[PDB]
Amino acid sequence: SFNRTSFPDGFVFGAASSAYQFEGAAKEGGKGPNIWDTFTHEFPGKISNGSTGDVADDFYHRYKEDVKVLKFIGLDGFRMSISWARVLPRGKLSGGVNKEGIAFYNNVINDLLSKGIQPFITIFHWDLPQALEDEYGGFLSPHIVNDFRDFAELCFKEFGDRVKHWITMNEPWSYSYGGYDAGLLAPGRCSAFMAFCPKGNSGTEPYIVTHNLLLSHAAAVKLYKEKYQAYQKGQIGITLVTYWMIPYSNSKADKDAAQRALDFMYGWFIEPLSFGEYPKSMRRLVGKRLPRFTKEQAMLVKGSFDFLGLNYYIANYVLNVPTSNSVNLSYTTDSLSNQTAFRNGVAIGRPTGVPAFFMYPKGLKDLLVYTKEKYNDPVIYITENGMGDNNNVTTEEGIKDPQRVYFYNQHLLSLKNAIAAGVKVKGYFTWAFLDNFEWLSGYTQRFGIVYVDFKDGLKRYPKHSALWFKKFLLK
Ligand SMILES: *[C@@H]1O[C@H](CO)[C@@H](O[C@@H]2O[C@H](CO)[C@@H](O[C@@H]3O[C@H](CO)[C@@H](O)[C@H](O)[C@@H]3O)[C@H](O)[C@H]2NC(C)=O)[C@H](O)[C@H]1NC(C)=O
Ligand SMILES: N=C(Cc1ccccc1)N[C@@H]1O[C@H](CO[C@@H]2OC[C@@H](O)[C@H](O)[C@H]2O)[C@@H](O)[C@H](O)[C@H]1O
Ligand SMILES: N=C(Cc1ccccc1)N[C@@H]1O[C@H](CO[C@@H]2OC[C@@H](O)[C@H](O)[C@H]2O)[C@@H](O)[C@H](O)[C@H]1O
Ligand SMILES: *[C@@H]1O[C@H](CO)[C@@H](O)[C@H](O)[C@H]1NC(C)=O
């Protein structure tokens, strides 16, 4: 039966997590507030059922038993993130290191390694300390770069003797678009015409924030390369997300619109990372709302990754949107494109428990080949791939997830094809290890290969998908 021998020797199979979504202990162990503590508490209308990550999976206390589950499944690796405000409660290094926070991550890492599981560490997975958001508006300010750099350094110093795979940040697209265009994610900023956020500007701030995200990423990578990489002997990268874009029709209009959508979502980050400049379509359509890289900045950002982390979930069809005399000025409308999961009333693939998300495993290969061909054959890890179930059945029924078995069977076959096509994929991580706090969707969506019974003591039960992976891994 389909198993890991179909993949390169030493290929890393793992599961993924993030700190705010899993940890809980949000006000414990010396931890300071982050923007997600603030967002979920002050805007309960923006979270399904007014949920928070106050407790989440309580991974902070339950990590020892959870690591046993990872070993049971037989995973090679585990992707997890560092809570910035847990290790630096005041955000700045000068504000002091929280010894209790450092100890937790050390404990998790030491346990993982005893089970032969490699920790892949995301330094920043959106949970910015409130102190930094308060001081200078977080990623709206160039001040964020030095503080991000110091945070990265703390991680390298404290964990780098054991951690050999670093991811600077998770999905700066989501942080910028979600936090500053649509106002759906912390810090919850958007234009007043949306009547959805207290402050913001969806037409300017996402571009400001993305620039500082890239610069912060680049600062961390430069420091790692110059100061830690030679003796710790690890690798550092960044995780990007994009939908795969398919033109709605055969028209030139829809063809160009599809590429514009990809330019604005993916190219926004991977062209600076590869070429030191933003995509031409963005420069043309966004004009002077799009920051320029100085010569120093372009030099720092270009080539600043050892590997690319890619998160893949879905493909969408893309329609051209003609220019209009009625403008809502926003990153969203700047690309003159419209995404839809339906063509001629027919869904792009099998449904999931997430209304927008349909199964399109071919898109994983297409994205990987596109990336190989456009950006000089980079080393790639699939740092997230998964699907969600609606949280509307009993624990008993939730555990039986043949649809997720199917999902991973199909996507791993597609990944196999990408590797055969010469894409240098070295690893693959399931989102998620556990059912968790899924940001604006709260606990209404279950992405785990392991079920968490939120109603009954947060108990863990491996799903059929976990058992499928256990067999796939010959473990
Ligand atoms: C729990 O929530 C899920 C939501 O994902 C429910 O499953 C979904 O049910 C809808 C409506 O029954 C399905 O859509 C329909 O499918 C039929 C036949 O395939 C189609 O002809 C209709 O036009 C309509 O599109 C949807 O596919 C399905 N989603 C899945 C399975 O992922 C489920 O009913 C809920 N369960 C309980 C116990 O409330
Ligand atoms: N600020 C809190 C309350 C809190 C904490 C986590 C999540 C939500 C709400 N607690 C205090 O955070 C402090 C650090 O975080 C600072 O709290 C004061 C804020 O003005 C400042 O911006 C923040 O960095 C810790 O040093 C203290 O031990 C602790 O009592
Ligand atoms: N989900 C994203 C991208 C995103 C998230 C929110 C809004 C716009 C775009 N990326 C990855 O998807 C994973 C699943 O994301 C879910 O996708 C379905 C949404 O309805 C749900 O709210 C979201 O958490 C997240 O848990 C990871 O933390 C994240 O890295
Ligand atoms: C794993 O797959 C290979 C095909 O490459 C097959 O020869 C082998 O028997 C399989 N093993 C199991 C345990 O399924």
Coordinates of C-alpha atoms and ligand atoms in Angstrom, one line a residue:
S1 CA 0.0 0.0 0.0
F2 CA 1.0 3.6 -0.7
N3 CA 3.9 4.4 1.7
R4 CA 6.9 6.6 2.4
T5 CA 9.3 4.5 0.3
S6 CA 7.7 6.3 -2.7
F7 CA 9.4 9.4 -1.5
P8 CA 13.2 10.4 -1.3
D9 CA 15.2 8.8 1.5
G10 CA 15.3 11.1 4.5
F11 CA 12.3 13.0 3.4
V12 CA 10.8 14.8 6.4
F13 CA 7.1 13.9 7.2
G14 CA 5.6 16.0 10.0
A15 CA 2.7 17.7 11.5
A16 CA 2.3 21.5 12.2
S17 CA 1.1 23.8 14.9
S18 CA 1.3 27.4 16.0
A19 CA 1.6 29.0 19.5
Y20 CA -1.5 31.0 19.8
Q21 CA -3.6 28.3 18.2
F22 CA -2.4 25.5 20.5
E23 CA -0.7 26.7 23.7
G24 CA -3.3 28.3 25.9
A25 CA -1.7 29.6 29.2
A26 CA -2.3 33.0 27.6
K27 CA -2.0 34.8 31.0
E28 CA 0.3 32.4 32.8
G29 CA 4.0 31.6 33.2
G30 CA 5.1 35.2 33.0
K31 CA 3.7 35.7 29.5
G32 CA 2.8 39.2 28.3
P33 CA -0.2 40.1 26.1
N34 CA -0.1 39.7 22.3
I35 CA -2.3 41.3 19.7
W36 CA -4.4 38.1 19.4
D37 CA -5.2 38.2 23.2
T38 CA -6.3 41.7 22.5
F39 CA -8.2 41.0 19.3
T40 CA -10.2 38.0 20.4
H41 CA -11.2 39.8 23.7
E42 CA -12.1 43.2 22.2
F43 CA -13.7 41.9 19.0
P44 CA -15.7 38.8 19.9
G45 CA -17.9 39.5 16.9
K46 CA -15.0 38.7 14.6
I47 CA -14.5 35.3 16.1
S48 CA -17.0 32.5 15.4
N49 CA -18.9 32.0 18.7
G50 CA -16.8 34.7 20.5
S51 CA -14.1 32.1 21.2
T52 CA -10.5 32.9 22.2
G53 CA -7.1 31.2 22.5
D54 CA -7.0 31.7 26.2
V55 CA -6.9 27.9 26.7
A56 CA -6.9 26.5 23.1
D57 CA -5.5 22.9 23.3
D58 CA -3.6 23.7 26.5
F59 CA -0.5 22.4 24.7
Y60 CA 1.5 24.5 27.2
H61 CA 0.7 22.0 30.0
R62 CA -0.1 18.9 27.9
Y63 CA 3.0 18.9 25.7
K64 CA 4.5 15.7 27.2
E65 CA 1.5 13.6 26.3
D66 CA 1.2 15.3 22.9
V67 CA 4.8 14.4 22.0
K68 CA 3.9 10.8 22.8
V69 CA 1.1 11.1 20.1
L70 CA 3.6 12.5 17.6
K71 CA 5.9 9.5 18.2
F72 CA 3.0 7.1 18.0
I73 CA 2.1 8.5 14.5
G74 CA 5.8 8.1 13.7
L75 CA 6.5 11.6 12.4
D76 CA 10.0 12.7 11.4
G77 CA 9.4 16.4 12.3
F78 CA 7.1 18.8 14.1
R79 CA 6.5 22.4 13.1
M80 CA 5.7 24.7 15.9
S81 CA 6.0 28.5 16.7
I82 CA 7.5 30.6 19.4
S83 CA 5.2 32.9 21.3
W84 CA 7.1 36.2 21.2
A85 CA 5.3 37.7 24.2
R86 CA 5.9 34.5 26.2
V87 CA 9.7 34.8 25.9
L88 CA 9.8 38.6 25.6
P89 CA 6.8 39.9 27.6
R90 CA 7.6 43.5 26.7
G91 CA 8.5 42.7 23.1
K92 CA 11.9 44.4 23.3
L93 CA 15.0 42.5 24.3
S94 CA 15.7 45.3 26.8
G95 CA 12.3 44.6 28.4
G96 CA 13.7 41.3 29.6
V97 CA 13.7 37.6 28.9
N98 CA 11.0 35.5 30.6
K99 CA 12.9 32.5 31.9
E100 CA 9.7 30.5 32.4
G101 CA 8.9 30.9 28.7
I102 CA 12.3 29.9 27.5
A103 CA 12.1 26.8 29.7
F104 CA 8.8 25.7 28.1
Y105 CA 10.2 25.7 24.6
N106 CA 13.4 24.0 25.8
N107 CA 11.2 21.3 27.4
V108 CA 9.2 20.8 24.3
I109 CA 12.3 20.7 22.1
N110 CA 14.1 18.3 24.4
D111 CA 11.1 16.0 24.5
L112 CA 10.7 16.1 20.7
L113 CA 14.4 15.2 20.2
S114 CA 14.2 12.3 22.6
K115 CA 11.6 10.8 20.3
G116 CA 13.7 11.4 17.2
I117 CA 11.5 14.2 16.0
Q118 CA 13.1 17.2 14.4
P119 CA 11.7 20.6 15.5
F120 CA 10.9 23.0 12.6
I121 CA 10.5 26.3 14.4
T122 CA 8.5 29.2 13.2
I123 CA 9.8 32.3 14.9
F124 CA 6.7 34.5 14.1
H125 CA 3.2 33.1 13.5
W126 CA 1.3 36.4 13.9
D127 CA 1.2 36.7 17.8
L128 CA 3.0 40.1 18.0
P129 CA 3.5 41.4 21.5
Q130 CA 1.0 44.1 22.4
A131 CA 3.8 46.2 23.8
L132 CA 5.3 46.6 20.3
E133 CA 1.9 47.2 18.7
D134 CA 1.4 49.9 21.4
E135 CA 4.8 51.5 21.1
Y136 CA 4.9 52.1 17.3
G137 CA 2.1 50.3 15.7
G138 CA 3.9 47.0 15.1
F139 CA 4.7 46.2 11.5
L140 CA 3.4 49.7 10.4
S141 CA 6.8 51.0 11.6
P142 CA 10.4 50.4 10.5
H143 CA 11.1 50.1 14.3
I144 CA 9.8 46.6 14.1
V145 CA 12.8 45.4 12.2
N146 CA 15.4 45.7 15.0
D147 CA 13.0 44.2 17.6
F148 CA 12.2 41.3 15.3
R149 CA 15.9 40.8 14.7
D150 CA 16.6 40.7 18.5
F151 CA 13.7 38.2 19.0
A152 CA 15.1 36.0 16.2
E153 CA 18.6 36.2 17.9
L154 CA 17.2 35.2 21.3
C155 CA 15.7 32.1 19.6
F156 CA 19.0 31.3 17.8
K157 CA 20.9 31.7 21.1
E158 CA 18.6 29.7 23.3
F159 CA 17.4 26.9 20.9
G160 CA 19.8 26.9 18.0
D161 CA 22.1 24.2 19.4
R162 CA 19.1 21.8 19.0
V163 CA 17.0 23.5 16.4
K164 CA 18.3 23.2 12.8
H165 CA 15.4 24.4 10.7
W166 CA 14.2 27.9 11.2
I167 CA 11.2 29.7 9.6
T168 CA 11.3 33.4 10.1
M169 CA 7.6 34.0 9.8
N170 CA 4.4 32.3 8.7
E171 CA 2.4 33.8 5.8
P172 CA 3.2 37.5 5.8
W173 CA 0.4 37.6 3.1
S174 CA -2.2 36.6 5.7
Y175 CA -0.8 39.0 8.3
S176 CA -0.9 41.9 5.9
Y177 CA -4.2 41.2 4.1
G178 CA -6.0 39.9 7.1
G179 CA -4.8 42.4 9.5
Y180 CA -4.8 45.6 7.4
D181 CA -7.0 45.1 4.3
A182 CA -10.0 43.0 5.4
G183 CA -9.5 43.6 9.2
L184 CA -10.3 39.9 9.8
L185 CA -7.2 39.2 11.8
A186 CA -5.3 41.0 14.6
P187 CA -4.7 43.9 14.9
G188 CA -8.0 44.3 13.0
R189 CA -7.4 47.4 10.9
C190 CA -9.2 48.5 7.7
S191 CA -10.7 51.5 5.9
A192 CA -13.5 53.3 7.6
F193 CA -15.8 52.8 4.5
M194 CA -16.0 49.1 5.6
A195 CA -17.6 50.0 8.9
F196 CA -15.7 47.0 10.3
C197 CA -12.6 48.5 12.1
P198 CA -11.9 51.4 14.4
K199 CA -8.8 52.5 12.5
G200 CA -6.9 51.8 9.3
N201 CA -6.5 52.2 5.5
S202 CA -7.0 49.1 3.4
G203 CA -5.4 50.9 0.4
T204 CA -2.1 51.9 2.0
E205 CA -1.4 49.9 5.2
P206 CA -1.1 46.4 3.7
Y207 CA 1.7 47.7 1.5
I208 CA 3.4 49.4 4.4
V209 CA 3.2 46.3 6.5
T210 CA 4.3 43.9 3.8
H211 CA 7.5 46.0 3.3
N212 CA 8.3 45.8 7.0
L213 CA 7.5 42.1 7.1
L214 CA 10.1 41.4 4.3
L215 CA 12.7 43.7 6.0
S216 CA 12.2 42.0 9.3
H217 CA 12.5 38.6 7.7
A218 CA 15.7 39.7 5.9
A219 CA 17.2 41.0 9.1
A220 CA 16.7 37.7 10.9
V221 CA 18.2 35.7 8.0
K222 CA 21.2 38.0 7.7
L223 CA 21.9 37.6 11.4
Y224 CA 21.5 33.8 11.3
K225 CA 23.8 33.5 8.3
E226 CA 26.5 35.7 9.5
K227 CA 26.5 34.8 13.2
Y228 CA 25.0 31.4 13.9
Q229 CA 24.8 29.2 10.8
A230 CA 28.5 28.4 10.5
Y231 CA 28.6 26.8 14.0
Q232 CA 25.0 25.7 14.6
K233 CA 24.8 24.3 11.1
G234 CA 21.1 24.8 10.5
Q235 CA 19.0 26.3 7.7
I236 CA 16.7 29.3 7.6
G237 CA 13.7 30.1 5.4
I238 CA 10.3 31.7 5.3
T239 CA 6.8 30.3 4.8
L240 CA 4.5 31.8 2.1
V241 CA 0.9 30.9 1.2
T242 CA -0.9 31.3 -2.1
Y243 CA -4.0 30.0 -3.7
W244 CA -3.3 28.4 -7.1
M245 CA -5.0 30.6 -9.7
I246 CA -6.9 29.2 -12.7
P247 CA -8.4 31.5 -15.3
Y248 CA -12.2 31.3 -15.2
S249 CA -12.3 31.1 -19.0
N250 CA -9.9 30.9 -22.0
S251 CA -10.0 34.7 -22.5
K252 CA -6.9 36.9 -22.5
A253 CA -8.8 38.9 -19.8
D254 CA -9.2 36.0 -17.4
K255 CA -5.7 34.6 -18.2
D256 CA -4.1 38.0 -17.3
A257 CA -6.4 38.3 -14.2
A258 CA -5.3 35.0 -12.9
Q259 CA -1.7 36.0 -13.1
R260 CA -2.5 39.3 -11.5
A261 CA -4.1 37.5 -8.6
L262 CA -1.0 35.3 -8.2
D263 CA 1.3 38.4 -8.6
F264 CA -0.6 40.2 -5.8
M265 CA -0.8 37.2 -3.4
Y266 CA 2.4 35.2 -4.0
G267 CA 4.7 37.5 -6.1
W268 CA 4.2 40.3 -3.6
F269 CA 6.7 38.3 -1.5
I270 CA 8.5 35.8 -3.7
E271 CA 9.7 38.4 -6.3
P272 CA 11.3 40.5 -3.6
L273 CA 12.8 37.3 -2.1
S274 CA 14.1 36.2 -5.6
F275 CA 14.7 39.5 -7.5
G276 CA 14.7 42.3 -4.9
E277 CA 11.7 44.0 -6.4
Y278 CA 7.9 43.8 -6.4
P279 CA 6.0 42.4 -9.4
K280 CA 5.5 44.7 -12.4
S281 CA 1.7 44.4 -12.2
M282 CA 1.8 45.7 -8.6
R283 CA 4.1 48.5 -9.5
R284 CA 1.8 49.5 -12.3
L285 CA -1.6 49.2 -10.5
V286 CA -0.6 50.2 -7.0
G287 CA 1.7 53.0 -8.1
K288 CA 3.1 55.2 -5.4
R289 CA 1.1 53.4 -2.7
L290 CA 3.7 50.6 -3.2
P291 CA 7.0 51.3 -1.3
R292 CA 10.3 51.1 -3.1
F293 CA 13.2 49.0 -1.9
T294 CA 16.2 51.2 -1.3
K295 CA 19.4 49.7 -2.8
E296 CA 20.4 48.5 0.7
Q297 CA 17.0 46.9 1.3
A298 CA 16.9 45.2 -2.0
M299 CA 20.3 43.7 -1.3
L300 CA 19.1 42.4 2.1
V301 CA 15.9 40.9 0.9
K302 CA 17.0 39.3 -2.4
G303 CA 18.2 35.8 -1.8
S304 CA 17.3 35.8 1.9
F305 CA 16.3 32.1 2.2
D306 CA 18.0 28.7 2.3
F307 CA 14.6 27.1 1.6
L308 CA 11.1 28.2 0.8
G309 CA 8.2 27.0 3.1
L310 CA 5.0 26.7 1.1
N311 CA 1.5 26.4 2.6
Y312 CA -1.0 24.9 0.1
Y313 CA -4.7 24.5 0.6
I314 CA -6.8 25.4 -2.4
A315 CA -7.1 26.6 -6.0
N316 CA -9.6 29.2 -7.2
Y317 CA -10.9 30.3 -10.6
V318 CA -10.1 33.9 -11.4
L319 CA -12.3 36.4 -13.2
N320 CA -11.2 39.7 -14.7
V321 CA -12.7 42.7 -13.1
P322 CA -13.0 45.6 -15.4
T323 CA -11.9 49.1 -14.1
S324 CA -14.7 51.0 -12.5
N325 CA -15.7 54.6 -11.7
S326 CA -16.8 53.5 -8.2
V327 CA -13.7 52.7 -6.0
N328 CA -13.3 51.1 -2.7
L329 CA -9.6 51.7 -2.5
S330 CA -8.0 48.5 -1.2
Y331 CA -5.3 45.9 -1.8
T332 CA -8.2 43.6 -2.5
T333 CA -9.6 45.6 -5.5
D334 CA -6.2 46.8 -6.7
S335 CA -5.5 43.6 -8.6
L336 CA -8.7 43.9 -10.8
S337 CA -9.4 40.2 -10.2
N338 CA -12.1 38.1 -8.5
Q339 CA -11.7 34.6 -7.1
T340 CA -14.4 32.0 -7.1
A341 CA -14.5 28.3 -6.4
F342 CA -17.2 27.7 -9.0
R343 CA -17.2 27.6 -12.8
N344 CA -20.5 27.2 -14.6
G345 CA -22.1 26.4 -11.2
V346 CA -19.7 23.5 -10.7
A347 CA -17.3 23.4 -7.7
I348 CA -13.6 23.2 -8.5
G349 CA -13.3 20.0 -6.5
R350 CA -14.6 17.9 -3.6
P351 CA -16.1 19.9 -0.7
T352 CA -14.7 20.2 2.8
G353 CA -16.0 21.5 6.1
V354 CA -14.7 24.9 5.1
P355 CA -17.2 26.7 2.7
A356 CA -14.4 28.4 0.6
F357 CA -12.1 25.4 0.5
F358 CA -12.4 22.6 -2.1
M359 CA -10.0 19.8 -2.9
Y360 CA -7.7 20.5 -5.9
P361 CA -4.5 18.4 -5.4
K362 CA -3.3 19.1 -8.9
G363 CA -2.8 22.7 -7.7
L364 CA 0.0 21.5 -5.4
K365 CA 2.0 20.2 -8.3
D366 CA 1.2 23.2 -10.5
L367 CA 2.3 25.6 -7.8
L368 CA 5.5 23.7 -7.1
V369 CA 6.5 23.4 -10.8
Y370 CA 5.7 27.1 -11.3
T371 CA 7.9 27.9 -8.4
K372 CA 10.7 25.7 -9.6
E373 CA 10.6 27.3 -13.1
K374 CA 10.2 30.9 -12.1
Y375 CA 12.5 31.1 -9.0
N376 CA 15.6 29.1 -9.9
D377 CA 14.7 25.6 -8.5
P378 CA 14.6 26.4 -4.8
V379 CA 14.7 23.9 -1.9
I380 CA 11.1 23.6 -0.7
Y381 CA 9.2 22.3 2.3
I382 CA 5.5 22.0 2.3
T383 CA 5.0 23.6 5.7
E384 CA 1.2 23.2 5.7
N385 CA -1.3 21.1 3.8
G386 CA -4.7 20.1 5.1
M387 CA -8.4 20.4 5.3
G388 CA -11.1 21.2 7.8
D389 CA -14.2 19.5 9.1
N390 CA -17.2 21.5 10.4
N391 CA -17.4 21.0 14.2
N392 CA -21.0 19.7 14.1
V393 CA -20.7 16.0 15.0
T394 CA -19.9 13.9 18.0
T395 CA -16.4 12.9 19.0
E396 CA -17.2 9.5 17.7
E397 CA -18.1 10.7 14.2
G398 CA -15.4 13.3 14.0
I399 CA -12.7 10.7 14.5
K400 CA -13.8 8.9 11.4
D401 CA -12.4 11.1 8.6
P402 CA -12.1 9.1 5.4
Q403 CA -12.5 12.4 3.6
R404 CA -9.2 13.5 5.1
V405 CA -7.5 10.2 4.3
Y406 CA -8.6 10.8 0.8
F407 CA -7.3 14.4 0.9
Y408 CA -3.8 13.3 2.1
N409 CA -3.7 10.3 -0.3
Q410 CA -4.4 12.6 -3.3
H411 CA -2.2 15.4 -2.2
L412 CA 0.8 13.2 -1.5
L413 CA 0.4 11.5 -4.9
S414 CA 0.4 15.0 -6.4
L415 CA 3.5 15.8 -4.3
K416 CA 5.1 12.6 -5.6
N417 CA 4.5 13.8 -9.2
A418 CA 6.0 17.2 -8.4
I419 CA 9.2 15.5 -7.1
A420 CA 9.3 13.4 -10.2
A421 CA 9.2 16.6 -12.2
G422 CA 12.3 17.7 -10.5
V423 CA 11.0 20.0 -7.8
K424 CA 13.3 19.9 -4.8
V425 CA 10.8 19.2 -2.1
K426 CA 12.5 18.0 1.1
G427 CA 9.6 17.8 3.6
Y428 CA 5.9 17.9 4.1
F429 CA 3.8 18.9 7.2
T430 CA 0.2 18.2 7.8
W431 CA -1.9 21.1 9.1
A432 CA -2.8 20.3 11.7
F433 CA -1.4 18.1 14.4
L434 CA -4.5 18.8 16.6
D435 CA -7.9 20.4 16.2
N436 CA -7.1 23.9 17.4
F437 CA -8.1 27.6 17.5
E438 CA -8.6 28.4 13.8
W439 CA -8.3 32.2 14.1
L440 CA -11.5 34.0 13.0
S441 CA -13.3 30.6 12.8
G442 CA -12.5 29.8 16.4
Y443 CA -13.2 26.1 17.2
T444 CA -15.8 25.6 14.4
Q445 CA -13.3 24.1 12.1
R446 CA -11.3 20.9 12.8
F447 CA -8.1 20.6 10.7
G448 CA -6.4 18.0 13.0
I449 CA -5.2 14.5 12.2
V450 CA -5.8 14.2 16.0
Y451 CA -9.3 15.0 17.4
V452 CA -9.5 17.3 20.4
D453 CA -12.6 16.9 22.6
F454 CA -13.1 20.6 23.7
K455 CA -16.2 19.6 25.5
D456 CA -14.6 16.8 27.5
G457 CA -11.3 17.7 29.1
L458 CA -9.6 18.6 25.8
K459 CA -8.9 14.9 25.3
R460 CA -6.9 13.7 22.3
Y461 CA -8.0 11.0 19.9
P462 CA -6.0 10.1 16.8
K463 CA -8.3 10.2 13.7
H464 CA -8.4 7.6 10.9
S465 CA -6.1 10.0 9.1
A466 CA -3.5 9.8 11.9
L467 CA -3.7 6.0 11.7
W468 CA -3.4 6.2 7.9
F469 CA -0.3 8.3 8.3
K470 CA 1.1 5.9 10.9
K471 CA 0.9 3.1 8.4
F472 CA 2.2 5.3 5.5
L473 CA 5.3 6.0 7.6
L474 CA 6.0 2.4 8.3
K475 CA 5.7 3.1 12.0
Ligands
LIG1 C1 -22.1 19.1 9.3 O1 -21.7 20.1 8.5 C2 -21.3 19.7 7.2 C3 -20.9 20.9 6.5 O2 -19.6 20.7 5.8 C4 -22.5 19.0 6.5 O3 -22.1 18.4 5.3 C5 -22.5 19.1 4.1 O4 -23.9 18.9 3.8 C6 -24.3 19.7 2.7 C7 -25.8 19.6 2.7 O5 -26.3 18.4 3.0 C8 -23.7 19.1 1.4 O6 -24.0 19.9 0.3 C9 -25.0 19.2 -0.6 O7 -24.5 18.0 -1.2 C10 -25.5 17.4 -2.0 C11 -25.1 16.0 -2.4 O8 -23.7 15.9 -2.5 C12 -25.7 18.4 -3.2 O9 -26.6 17.8 -4.2 C13 -26.4 19.7 -2.7 O10 -26.7 20.6 -3.7 C14 -25.5 20.3 -1.6 O11 -24.5 21.0 -2.2 C15 -22.2 19.1 1.6 O12 -21.5 18.4 0.5 C16 -21.7 18.5 2.9 N1 -20.2 18.8 3.1 C17 -19.3 17.9 3.3 C18 -19.8 16.5 3.5 O13 -18.1 18.2 3.5 C19 -23.2 18.0 7.3 O14 -24.5 17.7 6.8 C20 -23.4 18.4 8.8 N2 -23.7 17.3 9.6 C21 -24.7 17.3 10.6 C22 -24.9 16.1 11.3 O15 -25.3 18.4 10.8
LIG2 N1 -0.1 42.7 31.1 C1 -0.6 41.6 31.7 C2 -2.0 41.1 31.4 C3 -2.0 40.1 30.3 C4 -1.0 39.2 30.1 C5 -1.0 38.3 29.0 C6 -2.1 38.2 28.2 C7 -3.2 39.1 28.4 C8 -3.2 40.0 29.4 N2 0.2 41.0 32.6 C9 1.5 41.5 32.9 O1 2.3 41.4 31.7 C10 3.7 41.9 31.9 C11 4.4 42.1 30.6 O2 3.6 42.6 29.6 C12 3.4 44.0 29.7 O3 2.2 44.3 30.5 C13 2.1 45.7 30.7 C14 1.9 46.4 29.3 O4 1.6 47.8 29.5 C15 3.1 46.1 28.4 O5 2.8 46.7 27.1 C16 3.3 44.6 28.3 O6 4.5 44.4 27.6 C17 4.4 40.9 32.8 O7 5.7 41.3 32.9 C18 3.7 40.9 34.2 O8 4.3 39.9 35.0 C19 2.2 40.6 34.0 O9 1.5 40.9 35.3
LIG3 N1 -5.3 29.8 6.9 C1 -4.3 30.4 6.4 C2 -4.4 31.7 5.5 C3 -5.5 32.6 6.0 C4 -6.0 32.6 7.4 C5 -7.0 33.5 7.8 C6 -7.5 34.4 6.9 C7 -7.1 34.4 5.6 C8 -6.1 33.5 5.1 N2 -3.1 29.9 6.6 C9 -2.9 28.7 7.4 O1 -4.1 28.0 7.5 C10 -4.4 27.2 8.6 C11 -5.9 26.8 8.5 O2 -6.5 28.1 8.3 C12 -7.9 28.0 8.4 O3 -8.4 28.1 7.1 C13 -9.9 28.1 7.1 C14 -10.4 29.3 7.8 O4 -11.8 29.3 7.8 C15 -9.9 29.2 9.3 O5 -10.4 30.4 10.0 C16 -8.4 29.2 9.2 O6 -7.9 29.2 10.6 C17 -4.1 28.0 9.8 O7 -4.6 27.4 11.0 C18 -2.6 28.3 9.9 O8 -2.4 29.0 11.2 C19 -2.3 29.2 8.7 O9 -0.8 29.3 8.6
LIG4 C1 5.7 0.2 0.1 O1 5.7 0.6 -1.3 C2 6.6 -0.2 -2.1 C3 6.5 0.3 -3.5 O2 7.5 1.3 -3.8 C4 6.2 -1.7 -2.1 O3 7.1 -2.5 -2.8 C5 6.2 -2.2 -0.6 O4 5.7 -3.5 -0.6 C6 5.3 -1.3 0.2 N1 5.3 -1.7 1.6 C7 4.2 -1.7 2.4 C8 4.4 -2.1 3.8 O5 3.1 -1.3 2.0

